[PDB]
Design a protein around this motif. Sequence first.
Motif, PDB file in Angstrom:
ATOM      1  N   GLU D  40       0.824  -1.205   0.000  1.00  0.00           N
ATOM      2  CA  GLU D  40       0.000   0.000   0.000  1.00  0.00           C
ATOM      3  C   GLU D  40       0.861   1.260   0.000  1.00  0.00           C
ATOM      4  N   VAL D  41       1.867   1.308   0.875  1.00  0.00           N
ATOM      5  CA  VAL D  41       2.668   2.524   0.995  1.00  0.00           C
ATOM      6  C   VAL D  41       3.535   2.726  -0.243  1.00  0.00           C
ATOM      7  N   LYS D  42       4.079   1.642  -0.805  1.00  0.00           N
ATOM      8  CA  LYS D  42       4.871   1.761  -2.022  1.00  0.00           C
ATOM      9  C   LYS D  42       4.010   2.202  -3.194  1.00  0.00           C
ATOM     10  N   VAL D  43       2.804   1.633  -3.291  1.00  0.00           N
ATOM     11  CA  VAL D  43       1.873   2.008  -4.396  1.00  0.00           C
ATOM     12  C   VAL D  43       1.568   3.502  -4.264  1.00  0.00           C
ATOM     13  N   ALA D  44       1.301   3.965  -3.040  1.00  0.00           N
ATOM     14  CA  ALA D  44       1.016   5.401  -2.820  1.00  0.00           C
ATOM     15  C   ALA D  44       2.243   6.232  -3.212  1.00  0.00           C
TER      16      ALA D  44
ATOM     17  N   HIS E 185     -10.036 -10.007  -6.226  1.00  0.00           N
ATOM     18  CA  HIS E 185      -8.916  -9.420  -5.497  1.00  0.00           C
ATOM     19  C   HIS E 185      -7.586  -9.995  -5.975  1.00  0.00           C
ATOM     20  N   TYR E 186      -7.539 -11.308  -6.205  1.00  0.00           N
ATOM     21  CA  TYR E 186      -6.314 -11.952  -6.669  1.00  0.00           C
ATOM     22  C   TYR E 186      -5.915 -11.458  -8.053  1.00  0.00           C
ATOM     23  N   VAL E 187      -6.878 -11.374  -8.973  1.00  0.00           N
ATOM     24  CA  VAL E 187      -6.554 -10.911 -10.317  1.00  0.00           C
ATOM     25  C   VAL E 187      -6.164  -9.438 -10.290  1.00  0.00           C
ATOM     26  N   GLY E 188      -6.755  -8.655  -9.385  1.00  0.00           N
ATOM     27  CA  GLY E 188      -6.349  -7.265  -9.252  1.00  0.00           C
ATOM     28  C   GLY E 188      -4.938  -7.117  -8.715  1.00  0.00           C
ATOM     29  N   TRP E 189      -4.562  -7.970  -7.762  1.00  0.00           N
ATOM     30  CA  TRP E 189      -3.189  -7.967  -7.271  1.00  0.00           C
ATOM     31  C   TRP E 189      -2.216  -8.319  -8.387  1.00  0.00           C
ATOM     32  N   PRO E 232      -6.482   1.450  -6.322  1.00  0.00           N
ATOM     33  CA  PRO E 232      -6.148   2.843  -6.657  1.00  0.00           C
ATOM     34  C   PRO E 232      -4.899   2.991  -7.505  1.00  0.00           C
ATOM     35  N   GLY E 233      -3.983   2.023  -7.479  1.00  0.00           N
ATOM     36  CA  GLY E 233      -2.804   2.126  -8.324  1.00  0.00           C
ATOM     37  C   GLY E 233      -3.158   2.162  -9.797  1.00  0.00           C
ATOM     38  N   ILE E 234      -4.007   1.228 -10.231  1.00  0.00           N
ATOM     39  CA  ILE E 234      -4.484   1.235 -11.609  1.00  0.00           C
ATOM     40  C   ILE E 234      -5.294   2.494 -11.876  1.00  0.00           C
ATOM     41  N   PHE E 235      -6.090   2.915 -10.891  1.00  0.00           N
ATOM     42  CA  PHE E 235      -6.883   4.133 -11.018  1.00  0.00           C
ATOM     43  C   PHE E 235      -6.013   5.324 -11.391  1.00  0.00           C
ATOM     44  N   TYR E 236      -4.953   5.562 -10.620  1.00  0.00           N
ATOM     45  CA  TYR E 236      -4.112   6.725 -10.866  1.00  0.00           C
ATOM     46  C   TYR E 236      -3.240   6.543 -12.099  1.00  0.00           C
ATOM     47  N   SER E 237      -2.772   5.319 -12.360  1.00  0.00           N
ATOM     48  CA  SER E 237      -1.951   5.088 -13.543  1.00  0.00           C
ATOM     49  C   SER E 237      -2.739   5.348 -14.820  1.00  0.00           C
ATOM     50  N   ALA E 238      -4.006   4.931 -14.853  1.00  0.00           N
ATOM     51  CA  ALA E 238      -4.785   5.054 -16.079  1.00  0.00           C
ATOM     52  C   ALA E 238      -5.425   6.430 -16.206  1.00  0.00           C
ATOM     53  N   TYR E 268     -18.632   3.594  -1.344  1.00  0.00           N
ATOM     54  CA  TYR E 268     -19.169   4.889  -1.749  1.00  0.00           C
ATOM     55  C   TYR E 268     -18.179   6.010  -1.462  1.00  0.00           C
ATOM     56  N   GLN E 269     -17.496   5.943  -0.316  1.00  0.00           N
ATOM     57  CA  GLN E 269     -16.506   6.963   0.017  1.00  0.00           C
ATOM     58  C   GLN E 269     -15.361   6.970  -0.986  1.00  0.00           C
ATOM     59  N   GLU E 270     -14.852   5.789  -1.342  1.00  0.00           N
ATOM     60  CA  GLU E 270     -13.777   5.717  -2.326  1.00  0.00           C
ATOM     61  C   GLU E 270     -14.249   6.187  -3.694  1.00  0.00           C
ATOM     62  N   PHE E 271     -15.486   5.847  -4.064  1.00  0.00           N
ATOM     63  CA  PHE E 271     -16.034   6.307  -5.335  1.00  0.00           C
ATOM     64  C   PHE E 271     -16.136   7.827  -5.375  1.00  0.00           C
ATOM     65  N   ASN E 272     -16.602   8.436  -4.281  1.00  0.00           N
ATOM     66  CA  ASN E 272     -16.683   9.892  -4.218  1.00  0.00           C
ATOM     67  C   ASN E 272     -15.296  10.521  -4.264  1.00  0.00           C
ATOM     68  N   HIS E 273     -14.323   9.903  -3.589  1.00  0.00           N
ATOM     69  CA  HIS E 273     -12.955  10.408  -3.638  1.00  0.00           C
ATOM     70  C   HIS E 273     -12.410  10.365  -5.060  1.00  0.00           C
ATOM     71  N   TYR E 274     -12.670   9.272  -5.779  1.00  0.00           N
ATOM     72  CA  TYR E 274     -12.225   9.174  -7.166  1.00  0.00           C
ATOM     73  C   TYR E 274     -12.915  10.208  -8.046  1.00  0.00           C
ATOM     74  N   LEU E 275     -14.217  10.419  -7.832  1.00  0.00           N
ATOM     75  CA  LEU E 275     -14.936  11.428  -8.604  1.00  0.00           C
ATOM     76  C   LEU E 275     -14.347  12.811  -8.375  1.00  0.00           C
ATOM     77  N   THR E 276     -14.040  13.144  -7.120  1.00  0.00           N
ATOM     78  CA  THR E 276     -13.369  14.408  -6.842  1.00  0.00           C
ATOM     79  C   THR E 276     -12.008  14.459  -7.523  1.00  0.00           C
ATOM     80  N   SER E 277     -11.289  13.335  -7.531  1.00  0.00           N
ATOM     81  CA  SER E 277      -9.966  13.306  -8.144  1.00  0.00           C
ATOM     82  C   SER E 277     -10.031  13.621  -9.635  1.00  0.00           C
ATOM     83  N   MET E 278     -10.945  12.980 -10.370  1.00  0.00           N
ATOM     84  CA  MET E 278     -10.987  13.233 -11.810  1.00  0.00           C
ATOM     85  C   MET E 278     -11.633  14.578 -12.127  1.00  0.00           C
ATOM     86  N   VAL E 279     -12.578  15.034 -11.298  1.00  0.00           N
ATOM     87  CA  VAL E 279     -13.150  16.349 -11.566  1.00  0.00           C
ATOM     88  C   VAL E 279     -12.113  17.435 -11.309  1.00  0.00           C
ATOM     89  N   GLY E 280     -11.197  17.210 -10.364  1.00  0.00           N
ATOM     90  CA  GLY E 280     -10.035  18.067 -10.244  1.00  0.00           C
ATOM     91  C   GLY E 280      -9.063  17.952 -11.397  1.00  0.00           C
TER      92      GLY E 280
END
Lengths: 172, 297, 126, 124, 328
Positions: D40-44, E185-189, E232-238, E268-280
């Motif tokens: 988590e911390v490395k990804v961040a 979760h495994y495929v996401g990792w 979130p890693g894929i989120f920010y990378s893409a 829902y909290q993470e979704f709202n955070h992502y929405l704020t991130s892309m709207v920024g």
Amino acid sequence: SVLRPLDKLPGLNTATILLVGTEDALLQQLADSMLKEDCASELKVHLAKSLPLPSSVNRPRIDLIVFVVNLHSKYSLQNTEESLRHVDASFFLGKVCFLATGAGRESHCSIHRHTVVKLAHTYQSPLLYCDLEVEGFRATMAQRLVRVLQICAGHVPGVSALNLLSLLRSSE
Amino acid sequence: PLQKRLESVRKQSSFILTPPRRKIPQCSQLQEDVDPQKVAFLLHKQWTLYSLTPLYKFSYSNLKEYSRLLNAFIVAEKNIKVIFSTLLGMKGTQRDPEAFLVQIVSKKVLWTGWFCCVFGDSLLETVSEDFTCLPLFLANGAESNTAIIGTWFQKTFDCYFSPLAINAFNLSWMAAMWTACKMDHYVATTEFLWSVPCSPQSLDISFAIHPEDAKALWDSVHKTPGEVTQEEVDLFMDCLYSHFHRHFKIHLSATRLVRVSTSVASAHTDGKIKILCHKYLIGVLAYLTELAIFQIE
Amino acid sequence: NTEEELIRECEEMWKDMEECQNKLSLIGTETLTDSNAQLSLLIMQVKCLTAELSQWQKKLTEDVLITLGKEEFQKLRQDLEMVLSTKESKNEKLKEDLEREQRWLDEQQQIMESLNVLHSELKNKV
Amino acid sequence: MTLLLRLRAQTKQQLLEYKSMVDASEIEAKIEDLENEIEEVKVAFEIKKLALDRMRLSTALKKNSVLMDNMKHLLELNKLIMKSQQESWDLEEKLLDIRKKRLQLKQASESKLLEIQTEKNKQK
Amino acid sequence: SVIPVLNSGSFPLEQLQSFPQLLQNIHCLELPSQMGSVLNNSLLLHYINCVRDEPVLLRFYYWLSQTLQEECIWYKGKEFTNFLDTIIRAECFLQEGFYSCEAFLYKSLPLWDGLCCRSQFLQLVSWIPFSSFSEVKPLLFDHLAQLFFTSTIYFKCSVLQSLKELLQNWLLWLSSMNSVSKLIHYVGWLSTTAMRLESNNTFLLHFILDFYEKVCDIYINYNLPLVVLFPPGIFYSALLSLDTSILNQLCFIMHRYRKNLTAASKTYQEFNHYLTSMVGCLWHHPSFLSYAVSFLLQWSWYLDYLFSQGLQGLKLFIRSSVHHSSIP
């Protein structure tokens, strides 16, 4: 002489591999497959029959340890466990790997694969199955070893040996 | 149904459990239903091993129909006759089905086939009522006849014979198993055969031990009475290797074991079996019967 | 320019690496047998994990930026053709699979009416 | 140039690894939580580093040949991407309902054959 | 012969030569002595689809398993590839996986080099029976990860396609949830690890995002109240990547996520955070500088030119998801 991963300094974009086993011809052919193609980083190949490694003041860093085991002979096993006593535990943190040859031919496998599976799981080290005799399988294992070397050597930013160990870990 | 629990049981089948110890067979005379002449014909002969999937709709009554069908198939392929016989007393348990023999007689037997299963219940525990489980086949005769019979059986009962193979681990285990057996009349010295792996044909070491010396060494390396354990087999092999290296400074351990012969029986990796003594015969089958299951599963 | 500063920083981190190497070398390396290897390796692994976790917790010019940007546009333009070709290939693959699906659906249809009419005929007969 | 920066990066990872090793010189759930936390911390950290560096790159591009070729290529190729995407979307929409109907009909047919076989054996 | 030659008031099997004949005589069919010819004869496959007979299941299991063993041992090739292709074609029918292939793949995966018949192997993992994500991982997914972490990037995209097809098949069969959650979760990792691994190559990112689009419709496609969020890693990378089609498919995927969310706590909290991130991040973007150059080659409102360029997913996202400026 117990080998240590943290003895000297490596060269500028230099990587090294070590292969320990009994069949010299198989090791030579495997090294030929290793050096069929060369990446950006220069690669050094070392071949040995047993441990401890012969003394040499000019030895560079050995960033990867690979033990080849033939299920066709218990002699190769006894060689592996006798050689295993001349390396520190730090190598076991992802700098060591086991490659079994001839596992596909269940008739020719002298020792049962359960034994080597238990041996690998005991030390928490990656275990790979391949057939050096087949040219295609040998080539595939060639890029496999080249790229695992690239990962463990620290050339790619982001992961280390313990990271790949947590990747390649077996459930049981 | 049976398929689901069968999936589960072969899912549980992983190379993680320790190899269980095996009980040493004891001197057991031939059973009353066992005909001495039939086994005497069977014993002291060479047999080729084959693993078989369970028979589909096999009846022991219509043996003459099977004989005439095989005769018709043979003449279609082309002074010979096919004889079916039922052999009693060589089933490990009551669960194991009755065994039978098929013979080719030139009107002088030329080709013999034996279908059997001893102590084989795991296959019988995962099978429905219609099937007959005799996964062990022994062939003795010309290879062409064996191929023809196999083709007929494939067409008829929807099954194949697979040439069963024996590795060095299993062969060493069985070597220890029969050298644990007690033989009143040591009529054949134990003998092992090896083969160095090399593309050109190379030296094939044959190592023979006097039966008294072999028995003494075994009893020296025998710890659990009436049972054989992996440590016993490993120390047996280690003692033999150490003796060989002391003699010649040659690591026999780097060589493939290919044939093991003792006073009671002899085995070869390709699937050759020779049987001499009846006293352990049945137990022999049981052991090799497990290998058929291990090839089916 | 920036290259000289990068080289100087590389030499500085080389010096730091040499310092760490000569600092760590004053330890008896290790010795393990089969029995106690597992616990020792687990302890070493957890120690290394904690150390690197703590370490990570602790953690130019326009010309180089322009050159790297040109390189990345060239790379993107020179590798998009594979993903496109995959896109067509999967498009026709899905079209073929869909046609096969309608074929199977049609066949099983008359299969269903035949089975239903046979069942009704048998029910009426008895 | 590029070789210099890649050597610099490799020396950086080597120094970090050596620092971790010298620091470490002094069960399973704990270890598992360890790789979770470090991931988590490395990804961040990489998210923040990449964001800052190529955001600076984006600003440098905003401050400002084969560029026309690259831009027309990306436009055409991305248009082809979206066309393929729409085609796949509609094809998958068709596939979903046809397969669902196929499965429901398969269940119905299995039940029908079961009942007809049972009754057929019933009069027998 | 790889396929045994077929040997026969039940209707004779040889007389079955037309579809109407099968339609008339489906009730009085007789099981063949060997059912291998059932594979290349679709007529008997129609009755096999519903026969649900226990003995024929074991008979075909042993048949195909021993056939696979003998073909594999004889290979060490074109005939084997063709036979496996026929098996895959039959597997496309029956809408359910076989068990002989499953056992063969379990046995051969640890020994598998990854290149013998990769095309054939990777299509069988798509049709794997549903099972808890606690027994397959120790036996199956371990070697899968072993290959994945060391094989080619194209092989990574390949196994991604295989697993997304497996997910599609499993959802289709089900239409429990812990198993699919753990699989996701495994495929996401694996996804994030490989995304780091390949120096952030967008070629794998395309497959990641396509897989996630296939995932994002669980509630509306299979009536399953389960939604899983990508790391979130894929989120920010893409999201802040340099490719415009990436921006397109991210807009599409967050639109679909919002639609699924409004269709039915931390999610829902993470979704709202992502929405704020892309709207920024959105209303500029470097990926659009190309368009801007075109805008310089050719108008305060230039979004219409972007729209005509073909960013229809962008209209969908900015009109029906953000709602900050609903009007175009």
